[PDB]
Every structure is written in structure tokens, then in C-alpha cells.
Amino acid sequence: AKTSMVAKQQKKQKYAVREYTRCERCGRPHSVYRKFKLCRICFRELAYKGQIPGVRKASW
Amino acid sequence: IRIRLKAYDHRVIDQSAEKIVETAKRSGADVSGPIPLPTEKSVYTIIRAVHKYKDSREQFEQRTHKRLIDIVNPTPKTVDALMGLNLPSGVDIEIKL
Amino acid sequence: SIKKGPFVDEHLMKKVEAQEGSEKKQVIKTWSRRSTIFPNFIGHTFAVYDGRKHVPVYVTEDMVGHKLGEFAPTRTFKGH
Amino acid sequence: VEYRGTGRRKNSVARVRLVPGEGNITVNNRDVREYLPFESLILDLNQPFDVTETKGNYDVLVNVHGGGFTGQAQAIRHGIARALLEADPEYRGSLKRAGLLTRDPRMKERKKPGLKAARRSPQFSKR
Amino acid sequence: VDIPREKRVVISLTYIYGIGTSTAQKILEEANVSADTRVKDLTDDELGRIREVVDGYKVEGDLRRETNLNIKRLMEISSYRGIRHRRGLPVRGQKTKNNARTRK
Amino acid sequence: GQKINPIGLRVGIIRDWEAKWYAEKDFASLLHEDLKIRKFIDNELKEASVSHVEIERAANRINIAIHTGKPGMVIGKGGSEIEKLRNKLNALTDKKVHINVIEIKKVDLDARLVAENIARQLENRASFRRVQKQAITRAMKLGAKGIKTQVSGRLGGADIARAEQYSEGTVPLHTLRADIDYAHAEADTTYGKLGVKVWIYR
Amino acid sequence: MPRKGSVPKRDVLPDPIHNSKLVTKLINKIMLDGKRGTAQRILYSAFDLVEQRSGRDALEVFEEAINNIMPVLEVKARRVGGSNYQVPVEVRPERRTTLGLRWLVNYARLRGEKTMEDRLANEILDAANNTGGAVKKREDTHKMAEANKAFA
RNA sequence: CCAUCAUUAAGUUGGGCACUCUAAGUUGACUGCCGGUGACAAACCGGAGGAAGGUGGGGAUGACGUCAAAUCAUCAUGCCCCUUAUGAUUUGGGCUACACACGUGCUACAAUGGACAAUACAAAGGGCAGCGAAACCGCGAGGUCAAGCAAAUCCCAUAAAGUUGUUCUCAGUUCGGAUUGUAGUCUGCAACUCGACUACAUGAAGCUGGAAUCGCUAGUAAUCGUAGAUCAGCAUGCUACGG
RNA sequence: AACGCGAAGAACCUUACCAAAUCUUGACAUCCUUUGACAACUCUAGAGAUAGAGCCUUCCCCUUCGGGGGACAAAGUGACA
User: Fold this and answer.
1) At least 3 CB pairs under 8 A between chains G and D
2) CA C52, C1' H182: Å apart?
């Protein structure tokens, strides 16, 4: 399922209107943004490591 | 000329635009003062839960910080501010001429 | 998918062009669901596939205005 | 009588002048009698200059800026205020401790986060 | 044909078939219509201009019957656009859960 | 404990950026090339007790900054073990050139320095007191005030996980301009994983 | 926050039309949905039948009309269990001015017309002379805790 | 960004008016302050002092912790499988069906309105070959290509509600507008189930809502909306922002 | 703390559901080795993927040897995906 249909997005899909964007540390198609191609949760952890750019969390 | 200095935080683009507003100040230039442009932020309104729990929504922040510096006297014995590489971390070379 | 070419199917219609040479057959494992009807192939039966098993139903001249998709009952819904 | 003052109200600002002679209203060279339709707070718009008597005394020539046309108002009655405290500070007890030159002390509360909209809680489908 | 009386040409016509939403733009335009042409209208030469326009199509009671045999013809097409008039179903495939309390 | 990550509490308030680059345009492609070289970068260090990383992008100069808390094994002899990561720098992607290295005196003062270490002192499962009692007591003998480190996931061999912390002193762990670093590891024991949440101080 | 007991009362503004705090507090009561320009201007058309049936000016007749709404005995139900709890309350003049105006714009909408171009004009000059409409704020508490004076 | 310059079409042009608003860096409040009855028990109260008055305002780390709360259906992984299928592949159906209980919002039940036309005033935000202005075509949905240029500078868009001359009189009538046929207007290999319009036709409920139950203590309830994300194609779902 | 919930756009996909179609070292991530080193595009029949077929039968330079650091996976076996 996931590892087979991640090559469907990483290579040319039969129907590329499907947009089956998975991730590498998550098998996630349903929390992926345009500039991320990654789930909101593992990006949140490596927002606390400095691979995604500088994004603050609390104190508003 | 429109040397817009741009980064994520201001405190990196402060000293980065303070690199170009100072090294061209000692040059033969007529630098416009530091007049930063309106700086857009971005709310990434994710939901704070994992699968079910609504009324759990987390906002995020990422900023761009545009500035406005323009000098009006180009001469090759002075312009080491602009051609000489200094601080390319956040500073993409927005050297319009 | 535009009204440039007000949509006839042309792979039902091409496969009906691939049928209207010789005599047309009554039940094939075909779909005929997203395909519209015009009255030059009437009389012939087509197995519209509802989803479980394909079941045949014939094309009349009174089927002009619409598609062949409302033919095969899909559900056996009956319920209450 | 030439005094420069400013004032803001609800995502909308202003800046004024002053001119001697009598008192007039020149908000972007038109009036605030067809601008502001309800004709209500304009009656109490003189009460900023009623404690100073510069209503039919000091012409303003306002240049207003931004936001709603209602937010265009209440930035010019704070616009007159700082220009009046350099023109006539004779009534500054009835201008600073009463009325004119104070602040914008409250504005529109935000669409409150962590909730639906401005402290409205999302409608519970439970008991 | 059997329009109600004591109302305007934008207020009396809009009931019988072939006038509805239609005296806003369609029946208003093709007739010499005023704002308040009531039952007192001299409807022998004022109707005389608009009796040429009131008879134009099947909508004198029978366009409903034209659609009725086409409701039958769509049932002879055997489509869901007449099946849900015949089976209680909202005809544009709409919500046949609880919040459909007029058509069952 | 139903709380949030404390390392998130000071992103940009007290701390600085470990991502201080600028990639605005065409962010999608040249991000996947960062994490295509990243998934082997940690496995080649062989539990080096790395602190963290600070990636930098500047006119396609994507420079790698890995710490590798134990030194020597990344240098080699004057550029023998450093060229091998530089050879893979030209092998995975086009350039990626000029890998570096650092070291750390006071070897258990950082957060992830301990966290990668005291995870690796839990596969053997031998003296979870005394190795941490060597760690924490010497840490205040190395200049610390309140250090809080736990042993969480299924100690002893048991089928139930038992957390075992050690903490004392003054510990303002929630103030805005305090630099707090916090970690997590995945030392499994073939029945459950050791997610270790470390805290140290100065 | 009422469990601390007393909260400070909210204050009023006098309109420059009448220089009366209650004239604008009559404006602050008629604002259904808080409609400022749409209801005050139409209440300004809805004293035209108020002053048609009363030649006296509004600033005198509005303190005449509410003077037959301001009571001396109202009822605050005290915790006494199985009693009528009809405790006579001599009103403080804050709430006595407030309660005299509360039932006014509650009652314009159950008459023959239902247009607030003249619903507020219908309601006021029927409720001036202690007879009907808004006097049931005042005159009904004078027939509530009185036939049963045994439950003070 | 136009007081004062005129060639104001405000090319808001010459100069750059740019003085002020106007877009980014810094500090101003602190019962610091005076009188107390308040006696020292520190305060608090009373005022006026600052722009702010008593943290001026909002949040945030929610404490050591509780409910094994949900999810091995985003991931993992301790287990078993599973290995002609618990892997599948395509498109056919369906995920939206139907006697339906609860929910949830939308919108009516007008004449504090409707509607005709007017006049506004907007903020925030979007944009990378796109906004679609505008010449434009059609009463309409929506379409024929060019402009510009990556933008304090280019398009959305005049937002309306306010009010202003009028028709209805409170009513299901002109209030708005469900349910259905006609237009194929549209993007899309492909619009019956199972997309959208407004224009033709149908033109309904509908009388402000019992008992219950909800929030709301001011820019709040309520109200008119405007754009932005998910997105071929689709919001009464979501975030902001004006009034 | 379930109720315009997870779902922030269901003609295909989505679909996780089922039925046909024709297949089990698999649409996949690809290890090793035969390295057969690319049917890397299209006609016909079939819902359509799928079945009969002609195909950019090779590519980055040098110690001088046609051999690969990079080369399609036509086979595969131990597997397992």
C-alpha cells in the first residue's frame, strides 16, 4: 500500500490527479502541504532540530 | 537598484542588511537608509491532535522580511560590498542594477 | 471532456463502430455506463455492468436523449 | 493657527492641519454629514471642541486615511485633540483629564484562537 | 390564461405556466408592461398588444403536459431523472437521510 | 504526564536557528535532496553521541555540519576518514563538499550527548543506577545544578514499563529566555522501546 | 461574575438632541439587534405619534411616562422553600429607572401593526397614564405580593 | 502620502511635495505618584499626575499529575499472519442510497423591509504565465486575447448593511424561492447515480417557533460580508479581516 | 472530551469496499549473480490496466583489453516485498 504507492508519486502516476504524496518518516497522504511533502508530525519534530526553517511554537 | 535583504528572522537580516548598509557606506555610495518593507508571516494552522480530537489546533509561524536599500554611485574600486561575497546564509543575491 | 465534441463516448462508440460492421452482440463484459446514445444503433442489447455482474438491456430509438448509465440496477437496495 | 496632529481608530488612521478664522470641516474636501449616515455621534463630535470652544472657531482641513469610513471617524476627533493642545491648552484639564487627547483605549477584539470566533465556543452536540 | 386579478403585470402573471421568474426579465420584456398594471388596465387593446405574446408556446397549461409525457418518456428512457419522481427519492441524488422531510 | 515537548518551548525565543539558510523558491526538490543524504549520515557515525546539526544553504553550497561527540573517528589521519564522507558527498548528490568535525570537553554536559550515551548504557542493562550515578553526580561535579534523566522503557526484563528518574535542585524549565534542550531515543529491547527524555543544566 | 455579589453598574451617555442620559438610554433600549442608524432614526419617526397624542415635549413626557412605571414594591424571590417567596423590594433608583424602561420595547410587537416605524409610536403613549402596556411592570407587582401579604 | 507650488488627467507628474499620516527597527506605569483612616498589618481606598490606573490589554509554557480517554486506520513495532492473496492491478458500481431517531448549520417567514436604481466606505490576503481589470459577448451562468511584472508600485472589487424618490400593507401576496423540466454556460481522456450556475418554467415550506437547550458581561452577542488555504471539477466545512 | 467527528474538494483515482479482468521474487524498495544490460514509442483484440507484434541492441574516458566507478531489470534462486 504505502511503499508501493509512494513510487506512484515519486515517479509518474497513471492518474497524477490523485496526488498521492506520502512521506519518508510517515506514510502520510493526508497532512502534506505543497512546500513540505511530509507529514505535519515528523516535520514538527525536525522543526525542533533545524531542517525545516525557523518556526516558533508557544508564547503566541 | 533595490537591494531588498530577505531572511526568516529580522535579527539575522538586521545584521545582514547592516552589512550592506555599512560596507557601502565606506564605499563611494549614496545609500538609502534602512527602510524595511512590510514583512509577511504565515500561519500553518495544523490540528494539534493525531486522529480524532477536535478543538485541538496548533498555529505556526514563518516570516519573510523584505527591506529596501539602494545606492546610486557604482564604481569598481568601492563596490566590494556588493561583488565581494559576505554573509550568504539568508541573503540570496538580490543585487538588481 | 468539453462540449467541443458534445460528448459521445468514442470507445463505446468506437467499439460500437467495432460492432456495427457485422451483427451486434447482446451481452459482453463491457460497461456502457459513461456513454451516451444516439438512434443509429438501436435494437442491440448491451450488458451494462452494474458492479456485481453485467446484465443485458437493449437499445431503443426512445433512448435518444440520454446515456446508457441508468440501465443496470446496481444495488439490490430494497430495504424498507 | 497651523498645528499638525494625527489620530487612529480601528485599522484606520488620520492626520490633520489647523486653519484660523472660523471652524469648518474638510474631511478629504467633503463633509462627514453624508459620509457618516446615522447623524448621531457627529452631534457629539463637537464635544471634543466644546470644552475648548474651537468648533466654530478652528478649521481643521482633515486628511483621513485607511480602514472603514466609520473608522475614518474617531481618528479625527483624536486628530483635533493633539493639535488643540498646542493651540489652546488653556482647557487642558477638560482636555486631558476629560475627553480629547487621551488614547484609543479599546478597539475590536480579535477572532479568538483556540475557539470558533471571538470567544464563541463551538456548539456542543452533547448535553 | 387563468392568471389572478388585481395585480401588476409583474405581480399577476407569475403563476400560470410560462411565467415565473419570468416577468422579471422575459415576460416583462416581450410585453408593453408597466410597474402597476392592475385589473383596471383597459385589457382590450392593452391586452391586445399582449395577447399576441400570451399565446406563444405550450405553456397555456399543456407544457406541463408536454413535460408530463416527457416525465413518462424519461421513464421510458428509464433514467433516475424520472425514477426518483416514481420511487421517495430526491432526484438529483440528494440526501435521503433524515433531513429530507418533504419528499420521503 | 500528558504534556508537550519542552524543546519546542524555546524555538526562536531563547534558542537560535539550526536552520539559518534561505530556500524560498522551488523549495520542494532541494529539500528532498537534503533528506536523501540525511538518512545515511547518522548511521555511519556508529553512536557517536552527536549533539545536533546546523545545515547551511548558500548559492548551492549545502554544507553539512555534523558534530560527532566522540572525535578522531571522523578525521582519520589528516583527511583519511574525512575524505570518505567527502567522496560520498560527491557520490550521493553532485557536490555536497567539505565535511567538518568538532569535539566536546566535559563529555556529558549537553542534552543529546547524554541521551545517545545513556541509551547505549541500557542495551547491556547493567547497573542502571551506578552508570547514571556516575553520570549525574559527576555532572554537578562538572558544573551542573539540576539534571533530570530517566530510564523509562521496560527495565529488568519486565512486561510493564517502569520510569526511573533522578532530579533535584532549582529547575526553571519553562521560562522564555532559558536554553532548554530535550531529546528522545529508540533503544528497543525486543519487547519495548526506551524513549528517554533528558534534562540537564549548565 | 455574579458570585462576588455586587458588580458596578454600567453607565450612560446623554445625547446632544435632548441632553438627557435617559433619552439615549431610551435609544439604547429600542436597539433591537443593536441597530443604531436603522432603529434610532425610525424611533425618531416613532415619537411623531407619541407627540401627536401628547402636545407636551418629549423631555417632559418621557419622565411623565416612566413615572407611572417606577414602582415602590417589586418582588425578589428569596429562598424560603415551600412559600410564595413574594418579598416586597423597595427599589434602588438605579434599578427603578432600569426596570421602568425594560418592559417598554418588550411590548410594541403584539399590537395591531407590526412595523417599528410606528410600533414604538404605538407603544409609548398608551403607557403614560398608569394604564396598560408597560404599567404591568409596575401595576402588576401592586397586585402580586398584596393579596398574599403573608409571604413577605 | 498632496497643507502649501501649477500642466491635478490628483501622469498623486517636475522637484521628488513627502511636513504629517503613511511600512520596519526603541521605550514608555509603577497604587513609581499625592491625601487617607489605614494605622503601619501591609496595603488598599480617594483623587489627579503619565498616552495609559491600578498586571492599561491579550496569550503562552496548564504546574508535580488524573481519565490505559482515542490511533497499532497518518507512522512505527513486540506478536500472529499474509505470500494465486489480508499483495494486488485497472473501471463498473457505491462511498452522497432509503421507513428513518438524533445532530449541525443555511435560508425564509419583510414593511425597523423587499425590490428598482443610486452613493459609499472597506481591511486582511492571493498571484510563478497568472489576476482578469478593461476594450469585451451573451438578460445569464460563463466566455474571445492583448496589457502589465515578480512588485509600498499589477488585478480582485463599487463590498454591502446606512440612507435616499417609489410598489405592497404586516400575508404563504412583490416577502424568498425548496421541489422538480427546458439552456448544455462552464473546467475537466469521462458529469445518470454522484459538479456548479441564472436565465428560462415549477414556484413550496414559512408566521419568529412548546417543554427543553445553547452561548453572549462590548466591539461582545447578533448582524452584513470580503478575500485566503484543501483543490482538474465542486463548500451551508476551515482561517483571518473589515462594517 | 462523538455529531457538519477523523474527511481542508469522493465522474477515474481517492477507496481503505466489493465484483470482473489476468497475475504472484509481483504496480514496489531492490540486494547478489545470468549482468539476457532498456519491445526507453506504437497498431489489433479487450471496461481498462492487460494478450500477438517492428523498436534511441547500448553509453561517461584510458592504462591500450573493450572493461567498468553511473549504466534497464529480460531471468531469477536463497528470499521476501
Assistant:
1) yes
2) 36
